[PDB]
Subunit: 64 residues, 12 copies
Amino acid sequence: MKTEWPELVGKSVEEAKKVILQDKPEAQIIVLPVGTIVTMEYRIDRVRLFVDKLDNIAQVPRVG
Amino acid sequence: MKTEWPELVGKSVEEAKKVILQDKPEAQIIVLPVGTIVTMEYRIDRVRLFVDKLDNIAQVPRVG
Amino acid sequence: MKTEWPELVGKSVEEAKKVILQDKPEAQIIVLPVGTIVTMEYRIDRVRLFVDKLDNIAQVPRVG
Amino acid sequence: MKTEWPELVGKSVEEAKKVILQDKPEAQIIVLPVGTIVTMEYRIDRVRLFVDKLDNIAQVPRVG
Amino acid sequence: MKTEWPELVGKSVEEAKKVILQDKPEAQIIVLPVGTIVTMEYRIDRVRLFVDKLDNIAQVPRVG
Amino acid sequence: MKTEWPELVGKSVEEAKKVILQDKPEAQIIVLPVGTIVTMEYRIDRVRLFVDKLDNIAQVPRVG
Amino acid sequence: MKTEWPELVGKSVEEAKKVILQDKPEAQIIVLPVGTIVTMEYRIDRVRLFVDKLDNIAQVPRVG
Amino acid sequence: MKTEWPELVGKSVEEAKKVILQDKPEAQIIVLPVGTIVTMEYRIDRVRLFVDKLDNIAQVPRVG
Amino acid sequence: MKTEWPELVGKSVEEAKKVILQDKPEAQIIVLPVGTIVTMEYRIDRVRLFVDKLDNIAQVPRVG
Amino acid sequence: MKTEWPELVGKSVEEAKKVILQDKPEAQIIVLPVGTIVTMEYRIDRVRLFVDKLDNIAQVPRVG
Amino acid sequence: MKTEWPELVGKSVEEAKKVILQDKPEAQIIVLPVGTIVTMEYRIDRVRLFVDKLDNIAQVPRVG
Amino acid sequence: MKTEWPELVGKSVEEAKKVILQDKPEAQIIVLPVGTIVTMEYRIDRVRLFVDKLDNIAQVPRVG
C-alpha cells in the first residue's frame, strides 16, 4: 500500500493533490504549514501536506 | 447522542456546518486552525472544527 | 454583578459587543484569538472575547 | 514621572499615541500583539502598546 | 559538493533560487520563515531558505 | 567598530536601513518580528531589525 | 452533580483527594503541574488537580 | 483489534502495563508526561501512556 | 486592601508566607516557577509567588 | 548503510547502545527526551535516541 | 551606576553574588535557568543571574 | 582562530572542557540542555556545550 511520496518534495499543492489522488483515490488531503503541532490519531485515508511560504511541499508526504 | 463526525475529515467548513446542523440543530460551530491551544471547559452544544490552510476539516470534529 | 456571558458562545463580535454593553456599559471589550497567552492583571471593567477564524466567540466571555 | 496609562485600555492606537505624546513628548511608541514574547532591556523613553485583533489597547501601557 | 551559501545572506528569494540552481541543478528549494520549527530528515537535494518579513535570506542556506 | 544603534528605536525600517548603511556599508539588513526565535551564528556584516506591527524598530539594532 | 471544588484551592493533594472522593466516589484524580498543556476529551469521572511546586492545589478543581 | 483502554485512566503504570500486555502481548509500552509533544509515525505495536506527576494514567491509552 | 508586596522580592518563600499571612490572614499562597503559564481566573484570596531556582521570590507578589 | 533501528522501539538505552554499536561501530549515541526541539545539522556518525520517562526508546532511532 | 557584570560570565553563583553585592549592596539577586521566559517590570535593585546546568553564569548579568 | 569542535560530539563534559581549554585557555564553558532557547549576544571567549540526558555533547561546540 503506497504510504510515502518523496517525489513530491518541492512540488506544488496542485501537483501533489493530482499525484496522490492517482495513487490513492480515497485520499483526504490536508494542507498545513511546516512546523504545525500535530497530535492526531491515525487516519489511513488522510494525507497531510506540510507546505512552505509558497505552498510547495517541504517534506515527504505520508499517510496518517 | 451524536458526538463525532469522522465523515467530515477533508470537507469544507460549509459542508461541515451543514451536516453538523442537520445532526445537531443547537450546535455552536467554532472554526480554529489545527494546532490551536485549547484549554476550554466542556460545552455540550459546541462543535469545534480544526481546519487546515484551505479551510478544510483536518481532524474528526467532536462535541465539546 | 454580571460576570459571564455563556449565551454569546458562537455569536459574532458585533453581537457580543452589543449584549455586553447593555449589561455592562463601562465595558472595555478586547478581541483576541483563541489560544492567546494572557498573563494580565485583573481589570473589573474589561471583557475579553476569545474568537475563532471567523470572529465568532469560541469561549464564554468573562470579566477580567 | 508618568509611567502607566490605565485610562487607555480599550482605546485605539491613534488615541493612545496622542495621549502618551501629550504626557511624554519623547515617547517611542511600539505596537505589539498581546502575548508577544518580550525580553528586552529597560528603555525609559519607550512605551509599548499591547494590542488586540482590532488594534485596541488590551493592557495598561507602561514605560520600559 | 557545495553545501552552504553564505553569499546569499541578505539577498532575495529570486536571487537565492537562481544561484542555488546554478550550483545545484537538482535542488528542491523550500522557503520558510526564520524561527520555523524544523524536525525533518536529511534530504541531500533539498535547500531550505529561512526568510525574514521582506523575503530576504536571513541565514546561511545549507543542504538538508 | 559601530555595533549598536539605540538612536533607531521607534524609527521606520526605511530610516533604519538608511542610517545603518551610512554607518556600515556592507550591512546585510534583516527584518524580523519582535519575539522571533533566533538561534543563529554570529555574522559580523548582518544587522537584524526587530520590528513591531507597524514596521517600526522596537529594540536596539545590533550587529550579529 | 458536583463539578467544582473552589474550597480546595491552597490545600494539599492528600486533602483534595479525600474531599473529592467523599463528594465523587468514582473520581479518577489526576495530578498535573500548573501550566500543563491539556488537550483531552471530556471524562465525566476524571478530576484534574493543577498543582504548584509544593503540591498544593493552585486552581479550582473541576470535573472533566 | 483492541485499540483503546479507557478502563486504565487513573491507574498506575504497573497496572496499565499488566492489562495492556494481557490484551496485546507484542505491545511496546512507552511512558510520557501529559503534554509531551508527539509528532511520531504510526506504530501498530506501540502503546503510549500519558502520565501525571504520580505516574498514573491521565488519558485513554491508544495504540499508535 | 493590600494587593502587592514589592518588599518580598529576593526573600524566601518562608519569609514571604509569614509576611503575606500577617497582612492577609485568608491568603491561599501558591508557589510557582518564574515563567509559568498562568491563565487563571481572579481569586481575591489567592497570592501567587513566582520563585527562582533557589525558591526566592523573583517578582512582586500580587493578589489574584 | 544501516540507517534506522525499528527493532529498538520499547528497548532500553543499554540495549539500544549495544545493537547500534554492533551495527555502526563509529556511532555517537545521544540520548534525548521525546519532544526535544532539535534543529541540528546532519551528522552521519550520530544516532539520536528519543527516550520516554523510563529511558526506553520511544521512537525509531535514525542516523543524523 | 554599575549596570552590567560581563566579568561574571562563566563564574559560579557564589562568586557572582559576592561581586554583585560588593558593587551593589541593595541587590536582590535572582537565579534563573537560561531560556526562562521573563516578562517582568524594571526593578532597579534586582539582578537576575541566568545560569547553566552547573549553576554557572551563562550570560552577562544586568540590573532590572 | 579555533571556532568549532566537531571532534567532541558524543564525548563527556569533562572531556570537552579539557580539550576546549587546551585549545582556548580563556574559554568560558557553559553547559546547557539541547533545545535551550538561546538569544544571547556574541561572546568570543564563551563556548556553549549542548548536552543530552547523560551530559554528553549532542552537537558541535562553537565559540559564541
